[PDB]
Design a protein around this ligand. Structure first.
Ligand SMILES: CN(CC1=NC(=O)NC(=O)C1)Cc1ccco1
Length: 161
């Protein structure tokens, strides 16, 4: 069903999070961690303190899809063997966020064409810079479009709220 998912998403905040490659999403799915540049680290830390749930909705650049979504379980803290873009040192990253995956299934952008994000000029929700916040209603509807991930039990996530 969808009821525990809706409970986790109640009054949540949502952020569009890009990845440079599939490898880092794979690492994040296996290890329950994410790292960003300092600009988005600051935004996510502020949001983590502000809301019952902060949801990261992941999209590998140029893939045409979202690869799933996860809930922050921590603020950032300061080695994960990320596959970084050429010329980027691990020292340019902010800290590491712990995350609990809510859905590891993908959703193609074609399926979210009817959703617009008020915080990005009501452009289709797939459109946004890395770190773009997605307004509550749009973010909730987007998350509900993903195929159910029956491998995940949200019982333990609810207890972290
Ligand atoms: C794991 N992490 C991958 C990404 N995390 C993000 O938050 N945005 C991205 O584009 C890619 C490291 C990183 C931060 C910036 C570039 O590589």
């Amino acid at each position: 069903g969808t009821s525990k998912l809706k409970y986790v998403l109640q009054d949540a905040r949502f952020f569009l999070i890009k990845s440079n490659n599939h490898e880092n999403v794979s690492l994040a799915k296996a290890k329950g961690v994410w790292s960003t540049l300092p600009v988005n680290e600051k935004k996510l830390n502020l949001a983590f303190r502000s809301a019952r749930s902060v949801i990261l909705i992941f999209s590998v650049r140029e893939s045409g899809k979202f690869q799933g979504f996860a809930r922050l379980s921590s603020e950032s803290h300061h080695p994960i063997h990320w596959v970084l873009p050429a010329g980027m040192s691990a020292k340019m990253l902010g800290g590491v966020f712990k995350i609990d995956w809510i859905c590891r299934r993908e959703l193609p952008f074609t399926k979210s064409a009817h959703l617009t994000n008020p915080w990005n000029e009501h452009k289709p929700v797939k459109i946004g810079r890395d770190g773009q916040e997605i307004e509550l209603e749009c973010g909730t509807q987007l998350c509900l479009l993903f195929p159910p991930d029956e491998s995940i039990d949200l019982y333990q996530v609810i207890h972290k709220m």
